[PDB]
Amino acid sequence: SMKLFAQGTSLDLSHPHVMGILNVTNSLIDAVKHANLMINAGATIIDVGGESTRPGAAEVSVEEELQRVIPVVEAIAQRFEVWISVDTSKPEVIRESAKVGAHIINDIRSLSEPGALEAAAETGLPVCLMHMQGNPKTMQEAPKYDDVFAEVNRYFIEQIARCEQAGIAKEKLLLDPGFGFGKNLSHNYSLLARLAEFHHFNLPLLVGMSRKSMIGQLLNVGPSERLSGSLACAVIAAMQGAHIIRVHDVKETVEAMRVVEATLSAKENKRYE
Amino acid sequence: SMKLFAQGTSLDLSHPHVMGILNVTNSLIDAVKHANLMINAGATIIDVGGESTRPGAAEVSVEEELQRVIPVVEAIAQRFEVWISVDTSKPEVIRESAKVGAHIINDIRSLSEPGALEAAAETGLPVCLMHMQPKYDDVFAEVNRYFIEQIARCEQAGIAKEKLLLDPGFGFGKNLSHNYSLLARLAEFHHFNLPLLVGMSRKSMIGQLLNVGPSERLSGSLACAVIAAMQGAHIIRVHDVKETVEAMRVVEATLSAKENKRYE
Ligand SMILES: Nc1nc2[nH]c(SCc3ccccc3F)nc2c(=O)[nH]1
Numbered sequence: 374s375m376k377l378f379a380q381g382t383s384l385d386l387s388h389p390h391v392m393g394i395l396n397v398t399n400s401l402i403d404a405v406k407h408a409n410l411m412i413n414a415g416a417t418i419i420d421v422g423g424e425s426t427r428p429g430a431a432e433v434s435v436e437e438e439l440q441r442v443i444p445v446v447e448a449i450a451q452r453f454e455v456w457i458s459v460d461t462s463k464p465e466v467i468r469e470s471a472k473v474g475a476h477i478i479n480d481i482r483s484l485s486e487p488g489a490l491e492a493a494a495e496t497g498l499p500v501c502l503m504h505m506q507g508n509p510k511t512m513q514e515a516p517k518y519d520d521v522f523a524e525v526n527r528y529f530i531e532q533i534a535r536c537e538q539a540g541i542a543k544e545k546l547l548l549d550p551g552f553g554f555g556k557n558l559s560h561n562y563s564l565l566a567r568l569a570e571f572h573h574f575n576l577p578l579l580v581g582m583s584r585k586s587m588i589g590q591l592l593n594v595g596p597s598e599r600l601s602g603s604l605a606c607a608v609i610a611a612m613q614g615a616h617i618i619r620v621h622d623v624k625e626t627v628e629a630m631r632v633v634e635a636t637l638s639a640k641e642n643k644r645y646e
Numbered sequence: 647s648m649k650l651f652a653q654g655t656s657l658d659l660s661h662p663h664v665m666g667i668l669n670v671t672n673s674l675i676d677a678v679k680h681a682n683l684m685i686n687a688g689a690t691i692i693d694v695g696g697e698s699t700r701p702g703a704a705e706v707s708v709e710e711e712l713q714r715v716i717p718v719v720e721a722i723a724q725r726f727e728v729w730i731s732v733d734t735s736k737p738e739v740i741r742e743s744a745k746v747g748a749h750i751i752n753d754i755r756s757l758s759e760p761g762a763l764e765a766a767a768e769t770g771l772p773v774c775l776m777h778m779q780p781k782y783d784d785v786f787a788e789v790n791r792y793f794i795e796q797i798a799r800c801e802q803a804g805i806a807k808e809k810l811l812l813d814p815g816f817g818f819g820k821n822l823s824h825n826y827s828l829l830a831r832l833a834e835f836h837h838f839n840l841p842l843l844v845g846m847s848r849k850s851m852i853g854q855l856l857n858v859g860p861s862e863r864l865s866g867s868l869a870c871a872v873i874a875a876m877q878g879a880h881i882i883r884v885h886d887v888k889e890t891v892e893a894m895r896v897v898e899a900t901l902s903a904k905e906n907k908r909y910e
């Protein structure tokens with residue numbers, strides 16, 4: 374019965390959804406063709422991102438981010454029924470994205486930028502809170518935790534409170550442990566192994582492992598050879614009741630999720646732990 | 647901690663193993679070549695079958711099955727360290743397979759043919775017991791009862807419980823619903839304290855769910871493998887070894903980080 378509400382429609386999270394990655398970091402036409410392919414392959418959310426969130430990434434000006442993101446969000450919202458998430462940290466991109474039809478604010482920085490928290494609250498949209506240690510320029514230099522699960526859990530307690538106190542209701546929130554965002558290989562797998570334990574907040578869990586270093590470093594291969602590992606990650610997360618799976622390879626992930634759904638439907642508990 | 651012993655070597659079941667499918671139904675050279683490819687992709691067991699096990703595959707005589715199966719088992723045992731599973735129901739093939747180096751007797755009929763039970767016992771080899779019957783009142787309970795019965799039948803014939811493996815038999819007299827019920831509850835079969843072997847690769851339980859043909863089932867096959875392996879399944883029987891081994895390494899990294907070392 375978990376549901377999100379945005380832009381006059383709803384997203385029913387009684388089964389896992391696949392979120393397709395639309396990286397915008399002729400551009401507009403190609404972006405829209407890619408969205409269309411992902412929607413046809415079964416993605417029910419498209420994640421539009423105009424600033425690199427990779428280790429070492431450089432900042433993008435607000436004017437450049439607006440130019441990359443807003444025309445894409447608008448074009449998708451006008452042509453398809455799919456939900457649209459916006460991968461942004463900037464109050465102006467948040468505001469302007471919501472005006473042209475975006476459904477979810479998916480900020481790697483959990484609205485930490487000046488004015489972001491107020492901008493998000495003003496839109497009334499769902500907000501995903503993600504854990505990152507440090508920032509993208511520093512996060513992978515030397516990630517360190519005494520207990521990564523406890524520290525991510527504590528972060529979620531603190532950020533939920535921060536959001537509620539700004540007037541964003543608990544029911545609008547999603548949580549994401551932020552695979553690859555200030556974590557070494559062992560930290561990532563600790564979080565994946567214990568993912569179901571984050572259900573105590575009674576909030577949707579969003580995860581993104583597709584073609585990430587936690588697969589590449591395990592298998593010692595480049596990004597192009599990570600699909601089997603990516604599907605394994607997706608299935609592991611979805612078997613533990615993760616609600617949204619953020620991926621590059623939509624068709625394959627959707628097929629894997631249908632198998633997970635068939636399995637969970639046969640189960641009494643409806644989850645693994 | 648679980649281990650099997652055969653032909654002077656051992657199989658460490660503390661982590662999942664991928665078993666590659668070698669159907670043998672210059673054919674010898676091609677079979678060795680395919681075994682080589684699967685071993686280089688990380689398979690640690692090869693399942694050699696001489697009479698196909700598909701729903702209505704043609705039955706073959708003992709002489710034909712020996713001619714097809716024994717040279718392949720022999721060639722692999724001479725050339726590789728990999729374990730060799732033989733898919734047969736005939737006592738003669740069980741016997742002769744053991745003599746040329748097979749490690750596991752994998753009989754879809756659970757040694758129900760005349761003399762098969764005795765032949766298997768004489769070899770001293772590990773034996774896989776598979777459920778095959780679609781109608782059930784409670785499919786898990788029916789499969790669980792069958793294991794209890796076959797375990798006892800084996801022990802009574804002098805086959806130590808420690809030589810046995812259990813397989814719920816995905817796709818063997820089971821509809822879509824029954825197959826997913828057994829997959830959902832697979833971890834409950836650990837109460838026997840025996841190895842669990844599963845084979846879902848490219849099966850109807852994927853094909854019918856997704857509405858795709860047999861060459862378009864890789865993603866669903868990998869999902870099934872992962873679901874089984876996260877529940878502590880010990881051996882995963884597959885067509886697509888490279889991809890399954892990669893998925894199993896992710897499963898292993900996850901289980902190594904977990905307190906339980908499995909999901910239920
Ligand atoms: N919510 C959410 N948004 C995201 N955006 C990115 S991309 C940068 C990236 C970072 C680290 C490793 C590989 C990468 F590709 N990853 C996520 C995620 O896991 N969750």
Ligand SMILES: Nc1nc2[nH]c(SCc3ccccc3F)nc2c(=O)[nH]1
Pocket residue numbers: 699700701733752753754774776813815816817818843844845846849850883
């Ligand atoms: N132990 C064990 N041995 C096996 N041999 C086969 S091939 C049959 C087969 C192939 C294709 C479609 C349907 C089928 F029934 N499947 C298994 C298994 O699931 N477990």
